[PDB]
């Protein structure tokens, strides 16, 4: 009621005043001395031409050689990027898929979509074929992004404003986080696999804590739903790409927005965001049929990766950084370098 | 310049590619109908003849149909609506008799205007199903439509009311050339509903076929 919203409001603008006071200068002023990275040239080293429909997501294996891509035709394909081979072809139960994952050990891959079920597939089996190991249910909304903490714990973000941390062995949620007021559409874990962040549809990104479950910090400043989020390799920062043709990088410790990556020519939204090995280059896959590599410290476009026929809906960078993969709404993948 | 294991792996990849191509060709013959509605419009009545998205499979006249009912996917519709871009047709069901109050014709109009005038479904022909004919007939026999339609100048008989509903809902659209909207009164207890759906699917299939040949 009135008094409750009253102290909520006074605490909120006290928080914003504290954030403003703790700010003295943006990093553009201090880092203007450093040189720009210069032009970046990208050549399509390989092309992967197996799918038949739209491509929604893919993940890079820890070996930085195998990647698994999910497409609307209900087929999970595990590629060998070095030779463009097809290690496996997994026929999904429900052809509607909106996310994919690859376990760090390489044993399991995860798939999920409009069925609100995050199924787990087992790769290395004595029988020689790929079969489901555990089908997780309990979500009242569509799955958005599921990621593997390790071989036994998987954290998934759904569309019912809830992010959940599952448990493969038992099969039920060990902890459920719920602070958002809109659909949660993307997920990303810190390099230490202790903290993770989620991008909701209410222009707010929250930082969670997997140990007990509670929102450590709330980050806002966008003007539309956030479609993808990704951690800085340092683990003390992250970048968000919303639907208003902007990409912003936040600081976990400072608890404040830092940079805005926007240009007049681009008006389409952002579908995926990922960094490089050193984090110098911020890659974002727009809907204008191409990506755009952004200099993460000078907020200047360092090049364009334009080779696709439809909207780019996914992106990924290997652990060693030797290659970057994109998958657009045409049934293609490209391994740039 | 490939070792034995590399050649065997390439052979396995080619076999997988052949299987994928065969399955994709088989699935290309499928017809995908997206089913929508107001919830209590009577989609159960439509789906009778044959925790998330429910897929219904049925075959008529040597043709396989794959109808999807979004149903309990109560979330931001615009975020997952694009997954259905490229469906053969869209079935919209609205209850004629549900004009009493809590008015629902206005909610159905809002849903229809939001769905038809969507950037994704620009060319996908929308089929409109009007059901509960007897209940609506009894209701108009009792009370007129001025409760829902203050700007009504017509007869207090079911045929003119149904015609008004049909022309209004057809006028709800904007792109009258790039999109085709069908209509049918589906309260008859026969197979006419599936025949009408088949005819609409045949028309749209001919339309897609005319694109590949370049005759457009």
């Amino acid at each position, epitope marked *: 009621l009135d008094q409750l919203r009253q102290e909520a409001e006074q605490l909120k603008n006290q928080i914003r005043d504290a954030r403003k006071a703790c700010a003295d200068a943006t990093l553009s002023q201090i880092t203007n001395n450093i040189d720009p990275v210069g032009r970046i040239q990208m050549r399509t080293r390989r092309t992967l031409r197996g799918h038949l429909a739209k491509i929604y997501a893919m993940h890079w294996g820890t070996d930085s050689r195998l990647l698994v891509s999910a497409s609307q035709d209900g087929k999970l394909i595990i590629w060998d990027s070095y030779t463009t081979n097809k290690v496996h072809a997994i026929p999904l139960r429900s052809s509607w898929v909106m996310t994919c994952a690859y376990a760090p050990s390489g044993n399991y891959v995860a798939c999920g979509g409009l069925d609100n079920i995050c199924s787990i597939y087992n790769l290395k089996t004595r029988e020689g074929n790929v079969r489901v190991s555990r089908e997780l249910a309990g979500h009242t909304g569509y799955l958005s992004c599921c990621r593997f903490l390790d071989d036994n714990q998987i954290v998934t973000s759904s569309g019912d404003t809830t992010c959940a941390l599952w448990d493969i062995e038992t099969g039920q949620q060990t902890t459920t986080f719920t602070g958002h007021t809109g659909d949660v559409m993307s997920l990303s874990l810190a390099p230490d696999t202790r903290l993770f962040v989620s991008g909701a549809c209410d222009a707010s990104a929250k930082l969670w804590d997997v140990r007990e479950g509670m929102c450590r910090q709330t980050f806002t400043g966008h003007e539309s739903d956030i479609n993808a989020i990704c951690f800085f390799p340092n683990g003390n920062a992250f970048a968000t790409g919303s639907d208003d043709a902007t990409c912003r990088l936040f600081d976990l410790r400072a608890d404040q927005e830092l940079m805005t990556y926007s240009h007049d020519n681009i008006i389409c939204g952002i579908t995926s965001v990922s960094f490089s090995k050193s984090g110098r280059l911020l890659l974002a896959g727009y809907d204008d049929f191409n990506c755009n590599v952004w200099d993460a410290l000078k907020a200047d476009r360092a090049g364009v990766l334009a080779g696709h026929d439809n909207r780019v809906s996914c992106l990924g960078v290997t652990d060693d950084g030797m290659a970057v993969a994109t998958g657009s709404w045409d049934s293609f993948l490209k391994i740039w370098n | 310049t490939l070792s034995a294991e590399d050649k*065997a792996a390439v052979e396995r990849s080619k076999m997988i590619d052949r299987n994928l191509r065969e399955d994709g060709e088989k699935a290309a013959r499928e017809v995908k109908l997206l089913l929508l509605g107001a919830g209590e419009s009577g989609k159960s009545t439509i789906v009778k003849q044959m925790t998330g998205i429910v897929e219904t499979h049925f075959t008529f006249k040597d043709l396989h149909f794959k109808m999807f009912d979004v149903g309990a996917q109560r979330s931001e519709r615009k975020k997952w609506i694009h997954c259905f871009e490229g469906v053969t047709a869209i079935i919209f069901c609205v209850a004629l008799s549900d004009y009493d109050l809590v008015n629902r014709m206005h909610e159905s109009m809002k849903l229809f205007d939001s769905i038809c005038n969507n950037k994704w479904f620009t060319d996908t022909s929308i089929i409109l199903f009007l059901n509960k004919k007897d209940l609506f007939e009894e209701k108009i026999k009792k009370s007129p439509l001025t409760i829902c339609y203050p700007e009504y100048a017509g007869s207090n008989t079911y045929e003119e009311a149904a015609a008004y509903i049909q022309c209004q809902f057809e006028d709800l659209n904007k792109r009258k050339d790039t999109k085709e909207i069908y209509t049918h009164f589906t309260c008859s207890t026969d197979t006419k509903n599936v025949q009408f759906v088949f005819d609409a699917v045949t028309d749209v299939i001919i339309k897609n076929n005319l694109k590949d040949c370049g005759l457009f």
Partner: single-chain antibody
Amino acid sequence: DVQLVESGGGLVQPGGSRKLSCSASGFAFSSFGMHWVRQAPEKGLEWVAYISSGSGTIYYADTVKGRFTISRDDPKNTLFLQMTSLRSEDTAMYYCVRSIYYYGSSPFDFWGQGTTLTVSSSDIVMTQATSSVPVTPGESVSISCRSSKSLLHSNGNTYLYWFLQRPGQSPQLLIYRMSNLASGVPDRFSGSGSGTAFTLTISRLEAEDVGVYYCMQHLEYPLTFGAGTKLEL
């Protein structure tokens, strides 16, 4: 679980046309590459034939090329081997090796039980040097295998396998591609080496490890097995 049973053995006069059949159950037989390995009684192993998945590739050993026929029956999960004009040297026990080829896969992971047959009266040469090395439990032993051609392919992976045959039954895979460990084997075994030089080291040996050891190549067909190093005590 995975099972491989073969039948068709016995006694036959030279020049016959006996057929050998192997049946499998417990795995997706349609996506596996089949092999055949024979063993003369007081000898080592040697390749016979091989048919890939889908029956698309069929090879043979030059010793029996043109006289032996390979064939698989996917719907019935059965593997057939047709023999014609048997010679007196063909007296050996035959196996039903399985293998599946993809990146990171481990071929020759399982070996069939084996059936015996008796008849009345450019390749890479592998030398295993010693043939019998007495060993004692609690020690660290090393087995050396040598090859003629360089086994390090351009891809960076050296194609060579190891095989242990305990006295009495079929052999089992130990190490594939000279460094990786087979599934289910204890951590005790470990292998390394270089081009044309290969050593398998068994630190802290105990029982259950007695038997013969076989080193095999896979770089080009035909495959050739080593003479064998035999352990006891």
